[PDB]
Amino acid sequence: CTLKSFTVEKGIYQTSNFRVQPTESIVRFPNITNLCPFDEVFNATRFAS
Amino acid sequence: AYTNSFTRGVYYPDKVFRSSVLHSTQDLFLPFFSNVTWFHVISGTNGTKRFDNPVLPFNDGVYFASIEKSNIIRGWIFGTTLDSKTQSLLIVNNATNVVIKVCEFQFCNDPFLDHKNNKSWMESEFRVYSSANNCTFEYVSQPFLMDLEGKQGNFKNLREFVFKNIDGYFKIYSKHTPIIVREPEDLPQGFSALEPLVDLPIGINITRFQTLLALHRSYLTPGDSSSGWTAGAAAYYVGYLQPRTFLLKYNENGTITDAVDCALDPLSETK
Amino acid sequence: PTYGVGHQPYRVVVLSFELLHAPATVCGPKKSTNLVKNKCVNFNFNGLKGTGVLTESNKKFLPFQQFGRDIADTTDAVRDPQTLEILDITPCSFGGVSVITPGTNTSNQVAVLYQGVNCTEVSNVFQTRAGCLIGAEYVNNSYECDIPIGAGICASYQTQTSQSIIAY
Numbered sequence: 001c002t003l004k005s006f007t008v009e010k011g012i013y014q015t016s017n018f019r020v021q022p023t024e025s026i027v028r029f030p031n032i033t034n035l036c037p038f039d040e041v042f043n044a045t046r047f048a049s
Numbered sequence: 050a051y052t053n054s055f056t057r058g059v060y061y062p063d064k065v066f067r068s069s070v071l072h073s074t075q076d077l078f079l080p081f082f083s084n085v086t087w088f089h090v091i092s093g094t095n096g097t098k099r100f101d102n103p104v105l106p107f108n109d110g111v112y113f114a115s116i117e118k119s120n121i122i123r124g125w126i127f128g129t130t131l132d133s134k135t136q137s138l139l140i141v142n143n144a145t146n147v148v149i150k151v152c153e154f155q156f157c158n159d160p161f162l163d164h165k166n167n168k169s170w171m172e173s174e175f176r177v178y179s180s181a182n183n184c185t186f187e188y189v190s191q192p193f194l195m196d197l198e199g200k201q202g203n204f205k206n207l208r209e210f211v212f213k214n215i216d217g218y219f220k221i222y223s224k225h226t227p228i229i230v231r232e233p234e235d236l237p238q239g240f241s242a243l244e245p246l247v248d249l250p251i252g253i254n255i256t257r258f259q260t261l262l263a264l265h266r267s268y269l270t271p272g273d274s275s276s277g278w279t280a281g282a283a284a285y286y287v288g289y290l291q292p293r294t295f296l297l298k299y300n301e302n303g304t305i306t307d308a309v310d311c312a313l314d315p316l317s318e319t320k
Numbered sequence: 321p322t323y324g325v326g327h328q329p330y331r332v333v334v335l336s337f338e339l340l341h342a343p344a345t346v347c348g349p350k351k352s353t354n355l356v357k358n359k360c361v362n363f364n365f366n367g368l369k370g371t372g373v374l375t376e377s378n379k380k381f382l383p384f385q386q387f388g389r390d391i392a393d394t395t396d397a398v399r400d401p402q403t404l405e406i407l408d409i410t411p412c413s414f415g416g417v418s419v420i421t422p423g424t425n426t427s428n429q430v431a432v433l434y435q436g437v438n439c440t441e442v443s444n445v446f447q448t449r450a451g452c453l454i455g456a457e458y459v460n461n462s463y464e465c466d467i468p469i470g471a472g473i474c475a476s477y478q479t480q481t482s483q484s485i486i487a488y
Contacts, residue, residue, distance in 0.1 A: 003330065007424055008421050010421070011467065015419050017414075018437070018441075018442075026355065027352060028352050029408075036481075043333075064384055067389060070391060203406065217342065244384065245384055252343060
């Protein structure tokens with residue numbers, strides 16, 4: 001099909017492109033830490049008006 | 050007074066590992082063989098001299114390099130309109146911790162920090178603080194930038210600084226070296242790169258600069274010699290930056306050997 | 321306390337998310353996976369992406385750099401974010417395929433040659449200087465060159481006295 005004929009002569013003929021494909025995915029980010037004081041310290045009962 | 054800077058002010062580029070290559074980049078570097086303004090406090094000891102308080106404008110960077118054995122300079126505060134509406138930026142590095150804070154308070158114009166460098170007082174009494182209004186960010190970190198050893202005493206310590214205002218950050222570079230005792234206006238001829246330490250994510254637009262001097266309370270033995278008491282041996286240098294192409298060379302480990310200004314003479318252009 | 325549901329006190333916290341014209345700081349939390357080594361897979365670090373095999377190189381980086389470039393300005397060395405270990409990436413396996421045919425009028429037996437392989441990334445198997453030749457046996461004799469392969473290797477459809485492509 002590459003030579004576009006039904007009779008191939010004697011010789012070497014370069015054809016295809018061997019390729020290994022990727023598989024999984026690895027994500028890595030730094031040790032979380034710096035947890036903000038996003039909570040009012042255990043919603044301290046002391047509230048203003 | 051003025052001096053000549055042979056080859057200094059070359060900081061490290063972005064955090065990219067390069068080994069045994071010749072990479073060229075375009076950034077705000079310091080041109081070689083430039084005129085540096087020297088506005089240091091002449092004396093003060095054995096002859097009161099006028100405290101040098103230069104409100105030098107911040108023009109796209111500044112090159113600070115002081116030669117001192119004992120800590121005599123603490124703050125490098127910036128600002129644009131330092132009367133009522135300007136977020137301060139203190140870079141004071143005392144013995145306890147750093148005083149990085151952008152809180153909005155009453156801006157003063159004191160050349161010294163407070164007074165009384167003796168042992169009876171603390172390391173730095175914040176008498177410049179008048180009244181705070183509203184704070185935004187304070188980086189009270191334990192590792193301080195001021196790292197002075199003072200073991201031999203005869204050899205001084207040259208600590209450089211490169212301050213640049215990014216569009217959304219504030220990079221700070223620094224580098225120290227045990228400079229030997231030498232006469233003034235005798236900066237050591239040699240290449241030395243600065244290592245990045247911190248990167249403050251601030252969005253202020255500073256235009257001017259005004260530093261302050263403060264003597265540490267850790268008073269050593271009376272330095273009657275020239276390499277002793279540094280009360281009147283300041284090395285306040287200021288160098289402006291400008292965009293210029295520089296060719297950097299890397300070693301087999303990741304350190305820079307030298308650099309080319311790329312505009313010095315027709316010989317440098319061919320290289 | 322002895323009241324109705326219209327007297328219950330409600331402590332309300334009013335979140336006011338704000339995003340102005342300055343470096344953002346309240347972002348969102350991130351996760352992680354494990355470290356699959358020796359496999360050609362995709363990697364998605366903080367700023368860099370790509371695919372390849374993850375290995376361990378003996379490099380000493382300064383404790384402020386995270387990325388890594390090569391002579392041709394290509395990513396070749398990375399750093400583990402939450403482990404601080406020098407990782408080395410390598411491109412995934414690939415190459416070209418060639419077919420050797422001695423002529424359809426003679427026979428239908430053919431041979432393949434994978435350029436750039438050590439007979440490991442996928443029957444007589446022989447390693448040459450150009451790749452892995454699958455479908456021919458290496459004869460210790462010496463004849464004239466009929467089909468040039470590379471590095472002095474030649475092949476010809478010969479008899480084993482059944483006929484097959486031999487290599488010499």
